[PDB]
Structures are given as C-alpha cells and as structure tokens.
Amino acid sequence: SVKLTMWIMPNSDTPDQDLLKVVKPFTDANPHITVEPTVVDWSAALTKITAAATSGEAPDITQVGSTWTAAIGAMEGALVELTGKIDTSAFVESTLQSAYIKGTDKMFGMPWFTETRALFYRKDACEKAGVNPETDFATWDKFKDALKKLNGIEVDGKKLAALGMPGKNDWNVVHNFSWWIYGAGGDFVNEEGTQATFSSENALKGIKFYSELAVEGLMDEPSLEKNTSDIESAFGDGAYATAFMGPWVISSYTKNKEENGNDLIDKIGVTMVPEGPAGRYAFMGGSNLVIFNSSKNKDEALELLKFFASKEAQVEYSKVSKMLPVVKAAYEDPYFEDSLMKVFKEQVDKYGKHYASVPGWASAEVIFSEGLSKIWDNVMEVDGAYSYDKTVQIVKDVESQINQIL
Numbered sequence: 001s002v003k004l005t006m007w008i009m010p011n012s013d014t015p016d017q018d019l020l021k022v023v024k025p026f027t028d029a030n031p032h033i034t035v036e037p038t039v040v041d042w043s044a045a046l047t048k049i050t051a052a053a054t055s056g057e058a059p060d061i062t063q064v065g066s067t068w069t070a071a072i073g074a075m076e077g078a079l080v081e082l083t084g085k086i087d088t089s090a091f092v093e094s095t096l097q098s099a100y101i102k103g104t105d106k107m108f109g110m111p112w113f114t115e116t117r118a119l120f121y122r123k124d125a126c127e128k129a130g131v132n133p134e135t136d137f138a139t140w141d142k143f144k145d146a147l148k149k150l151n152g153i154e155v156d157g158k159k160l161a162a163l164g165m166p167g168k169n170d171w172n173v174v175h176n177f178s179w180w181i182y183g184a185g186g187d188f189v190n191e192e193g194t195q196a197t198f199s200s201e202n203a204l205k206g207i208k209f210y211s212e213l214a215v216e217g218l219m220d221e222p223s224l225e226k227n228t229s230d231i232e233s234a235f236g237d238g239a240y241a242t243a244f245m246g247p248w249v250i251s252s253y254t255k256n257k258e259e260n261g262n263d264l265i266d267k268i269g270v271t272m273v274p275e276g277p278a279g280r281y282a283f284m285g286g287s288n289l290v291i292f293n294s295s296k297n298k299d300e301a302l303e304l305l306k307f308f309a310s311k312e313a314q315v316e317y318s319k320v321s322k323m324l325p326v327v328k329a330a331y332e333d334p335y336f337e338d339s340l341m342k343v344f345k346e347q348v349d350k351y352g353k354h355y356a357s358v359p360g361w362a363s364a365e366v367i368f369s370e371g372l373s374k375i376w377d378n379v380m381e382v383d384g385a386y387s388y389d390k391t392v393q394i395v396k397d398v399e400s401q402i403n404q405i406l
C-alpha cells in the first residue's frame with residue numbers, strides 16, 4: 001500500500017472533494033495507491049512550499065503557481081527534475097514555458113491548467129447605455145468611451161459603477177496590471193529576464209492609462225481597497241457593469257442561481273481584453289504540478305502526474321474548476337463548445353503572455369503586490385491629492401528593488 005499526499009490551492013468550490021472525484025478512476029485502476037489532498041490557501045502557498053522544499057516535512061506532490069515554478073525548481077535538491085519523464089508532445093506548447101527554468105533546459109514542473117483574465121460585462125447594462133459589446137470594447141479608446149456611457153447606469157433599481165477591480169492584498173495586483181503594461185508596449189523584464197524594465201516610457205503609459213480610469217471616475221474607488229475575492233462576489237451581486245476576471249467565477253455565479261435565485265449568470269457575457277497600441281496582449285497564468293525530491297514514492301507520484309495530464313482528467317477538472325486544460329486533445333470534448341469558455345481559450349492561445357520563468361520572479365511578486373498597491377493609494381488620495389509623478393516615483397522604487405533581487 002502506497003499513500004500519496006497532495007497539496008492543492010483552492011481551485012474549485014470544494015477543493016479536496018472535487019479533486020478526489022477527478023482522481024477516482026486513477027485510484028479505482030490502482031488499488032494499491034491512495035491519494036490524500038490537502039488545501040493550502042494562495043496567500044500562504046509560496047512560504048509553505050518553500051519551507052517544505054527545505055525542511056523535509058513535505059507531501060509527495062504539490063500544485064505550484066506557474067509563475068513560481070522556477071523559484072522552487074532552482075532550490076537545490078528541492079524538486080524532481082521531470083525532463084524526459086513526462087511526454088510533453090501532448091501539451092499545448094505555450095504552457096511548457098513556465099515548467100522550465102529560463103535560460104536552462106531543466107523542467108521541474110508539469111503543466112496542469114492555465115487561465116487568463118477576460119472582460120465580463122452585463123448585457124442589460126450595455127443595452128441600457130447604448131453600448132454594443134461586440135465592437136465597443138475592442139480597443140483601449142473605445143473601451144474607455146464605453147465606460148463613460150456605463151458609469152452610473154441604472155439597471156433594475158440600482159446604479160452600477162462602470163468597472164469594478166480589486167486593488168490590494170493578493171497576488172493578482174501585478175497580474176491585473178500585466179496586460180495593460182504589455183498593451184502599452186512595455187514589459188516587466190528584458191529578453192534575458194535579468195533586469196527590470198517596467199519603468200520604461202511604454203510601461204508607465206500602460207500603468208498611467210489603467211490607474212487613471214479610477215482617477216477619472218470610471219472605476220469604483222471603494223473596490224480598490226478590496227481583494228479579488230471581494231470584487232468577484234460584488235460583481236456576482238450586480239455591483240458593476242464590467243470587470244476583468246478569471247474563468248472560475250462562472251462556477252460561483254452558477255451556484256448563486258441554483259441556491260439563491262440570483263440571475264446574474266444569465267445577464268453576463270465575456271469578451272477579450274481591449275487591444276492597446278502595442279496590439280492585444282493577455283495575462284497567461286495557471287499552475288504546474290511538481291514532485292518533491294524528498295518523496296519516498298516518486299514512481300507512483302509520476303503515475304499520478306501522468307493521470308492528471310490524461311485527456312479525460314483534464315476535461316473533468318476543467319468542468320469543475322473552469323480552468324483551462326493544458327493538453328491539446330481535451331479541447332475535442334463537446335464541453336468546450338460553451339460560448340464563455342471559448343473566449344478564454346481563444347484569448348490565451350492568440351495573445352497570452354507569461355512572465356519570465358526566472359528564479360527571482362516569485363520574490364518579485366511580493367514586491368509588486370506591495371508597490372503597485374501604493375499606486376492605488378495614490379489614486380484614492382489617502383495621503384494627499386493624486387499625482388502621476390508619485391506613481392512614477394513608486395515604480396522607480398519598485399524597479400530598483402527587483403533589480404537587486406534579479
């Protein structure tokens with residue numbers, strides 16, 4: 001008897017039991033192997049994974065955020081190197097970038113799922129404001145003009161803010177700036193991933209354009225004090241005409257209808273992020289699976305990773321989590337005929353950009369979270385009138401620290 005233990009982040013409504021249903025055919029086929037998952041929240045996941053990779057008190061397998069895989073893989077003796085042990089030919093090729101440490105051929109993670117952030121909108125709000133969501137969100141400029149028509153629009157008995165986005169207290173602070181920086185023609189690092197570059201003229205233009213949506217009254221200011229979880233539920237309760245969100249919110253909005261009679265899920269559509277002056281770019285995220293080097297059952301752990309990469313396991317976890325499969329053949333399933341999900345798939349395939357997979361990037365994300373949130377403090381005028389020059393100073397200070405980290 002072999003007991004495999006697994007750490008997962010909260011990818012679905014009931015994470016441990018949802019995972020156990022997906023792995024049931026594996027444990028039915030292998031009666032000598034059991035799978036025991038434990039949930040670790042996103043806020044503590046980096047610290048807990050790092051400590052486990054060093055101390056030795058570790059599960060066999062853990063989920064790792066795709067942007068963290070290089071940081072954990074670069075710790076000596078932390079992870080099993082997976083090169084040659086996983087057959088990558090079945091995978092969407094773009095998903096492998098985060099599985100390797102950049103500048104090396106070393107693969108320490110297996111892609112498990114991907115995600116992107118798309119533009120959710122209220123159909124009833126758009127029709128009341130005279131906004132055509134087929135065309136009026138296509139570019140930055142048209143998107144901004146649509147927000148002006150949507151700001152304060154009354155639908156049913158209440159007025160909606162045009163755009164609702166979080167500002168603080170999770171990893172999504174940098175993720176939500178990423179594609180505005182890309183769309184402006186900027187980037188976070190140079191091609192080598194050795195030097196920070198997000199204080200460039202273009203990167204600041206994207207930061208300026210996005211953050212000043214709130215200065216101009218089009219983004220709900222109180223929501224900038226809150227985290228992603230708070231703003232997703234606010235959108236599901238009808239507070240905003242639009243919001244940029246991951247696909248997982250569809251699970252929660254569907255449940256709200258089944259449990260509370262909340263009809264929000266029937267009133268929304270999704271489109272790709274507006275195109276900026278650089279062309280269209282989108283945040284590309286997701287998670288990998290890794291095997292700890294301290295595992296006493298690496299062969300069985302490898303069999304489980306291969307199962308998670310199988311076509312049907314990819315389809316089933318996508319159905320419950322709404323995350324995107326990383327295996328090409330999963331998209332032959334009729335489920336991916338859904339109009340909402342197809343937008344996330346088309347966006348990430350054509351326009352998804354992932355951060356440089358460098359060891360210092362996980363540490364940099366902690367720095368971004370703090371620093372980019374000060375830009376929202378500036379916009380919200382908690383300490384004096386808003387000044388773009390203060391934003392410039394904040395980004396310059398963040399850039400210097402990340403350069404030391406890199």
Ligand SMILES: OC[C@H]1O[C@@H](O[C@H]2[C@H](O)[C@@H](O)[C@H](O[C@H]3[C@H](O)[C@@H](O)[C@H](O[C@H]4[C@H](O)[C@@H](O)[C@H](O[C@H]5[C@H](O)[C@@H](O)[C@H](O)O[C@@H]5CO)O[C@@H]4CO)O[C@@H]3CO)O[C@@H]2CO)[C@H](O)[C@@H](O)[C@@H]1O
Binds near residue numbers: 014065170172
């Ligand atoms: O930078 C690191 C890493 O980030 C990845 O992106 C992450 C992102 O960091 C996370 O913030 C995000 O977390 C979301 C979860 O994926 C999603 O499952 C979760 O869904 C919640 C739901 O919001 C919540 O309502 C629900 O509570 C229910 C209860 O379970 C019931 O008991 C109760 O009665 O009713 C409620 C209603 O459903 O629970 C679920 C699960 O907890 O919401 C999170 C956002 O708030 O996930 C992103 C993707 O993983 C990025 O992809 C990586 O590349 C990167 O490395």
